[model samples]
Target: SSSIKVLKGLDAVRKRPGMYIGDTDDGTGLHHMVFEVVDNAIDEALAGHCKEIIVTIHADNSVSVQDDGRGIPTGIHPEEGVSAAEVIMTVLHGVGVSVVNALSQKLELVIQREGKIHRQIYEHGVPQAPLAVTGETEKTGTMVRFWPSLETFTNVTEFEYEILAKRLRELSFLNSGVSIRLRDKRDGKEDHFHYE
Candidate 1:
């Protein structure tokens, strides 16, 4: 009890992945990867900003969650003097998207804010680069994608659609005026949830 030390940056999660997501060896932490990101999208919807969310389980085992919201701020952290996105990859989870980064091999955040598309990439829980305007976009939103790392969860083979579907189905009922879509490319399955 006397060896207490503070964890910093993504290292906080990297060293103790199970501390944030439980039962990694039994493959029970999968929901956390999706929930961490999706919850933020729902938060926007709850706040009357986001109108839609799309979650995809790619064939490569990579996951992507997109939403039509105001998008994560990409300006600057006056205190850190770094790009807002970098500050996110380092501190705020990039709109609560960094846990996905900490738990995966790599994570990409594409933010459609204003008239531009800002993108940032992180690897093994570390920001590999700075956030930059990748191009132009007509709308404001965010698309966060990640390749879940097995270095931490070696016993996990893949993500189960059934488990994820069950969770997404429940989240949709929040009726925040936001529609959510979950697509499984490997199983050739798709699901959409919305409220009237």
Candidate 2:
């Protein structure tokens, strides 16, 4: 039997995450997630706000991407009548990035903008809560920490540092003043990249 189906929001991403990401039992999907997040940060950089990016791989199969940039706007979006943060999760970011959030076991997005810090959490692309004002900070940026959903990935829980390094080096070369500091806690090694 066959029928037509229309999915909502991240539900499409959750069910056919492989299409949104990659094939199961391989690591391409995991790799793409990092790039997608880094891309948004790079987008911020090109906007003349984002400067520094930190990508850290932990021992527990978790990764965190943080940037120093004009974080996602916290104000109420006119169309959605909701916080910009809410609009972001369901909307497009640098093409295939929202797909990253949808395929994560859990995601924590912390944005610092205009001296105010806000945080939002999502579990498998579903919002756990609305945007919560955490506090204020002198610096502004966005930090996205996520663990690829065990339900979506097969054997890609552990990511490769060398694979990531090459890409970071390329990005650093492409953008002047864009610095990326990568730390591999799993191997107790780290590297820094910056061009000009």
Q: Write the per-residue lDDT of candidate 1 for residues 85-158, one digit (tens) a residue.
A: 66555553323565667778988889999899998887876766668888988999988888888887767758
Question: Once model 1 is optimally superposed onto the true structure by TM-score, how far is the C-alpha of residue 186 displaced, in angstroms?
Answer: 1.6
Question: For this target, which candidate reaches the highest TM-score against the unseen true structure?
Answer: 2
Worst 10 residues of 2 by lDDT: 1-10
Model 1 poorest ten-residue lDDT run? 1-10
Q: How close is candidate 2 to the true structure, as a TM-score?
A: 0.90
Q: Give each model's whole-structure lDDT.
A: 0.77, 0.81
TM-score of each: 0.89, 0.90
Encode model 2's per-residue lDDT on 82-171: one tens digit a residue: 687667665544454678887888889999988889998987776778788899889888899888888888776688999899999999
Superposed Cα RMSD, model 2? 3.9
**Candidate 2 residue spans exceeding 4 A from truth:** 1-7, 92-94
Cα RMSD for predicted model 1: 4.0
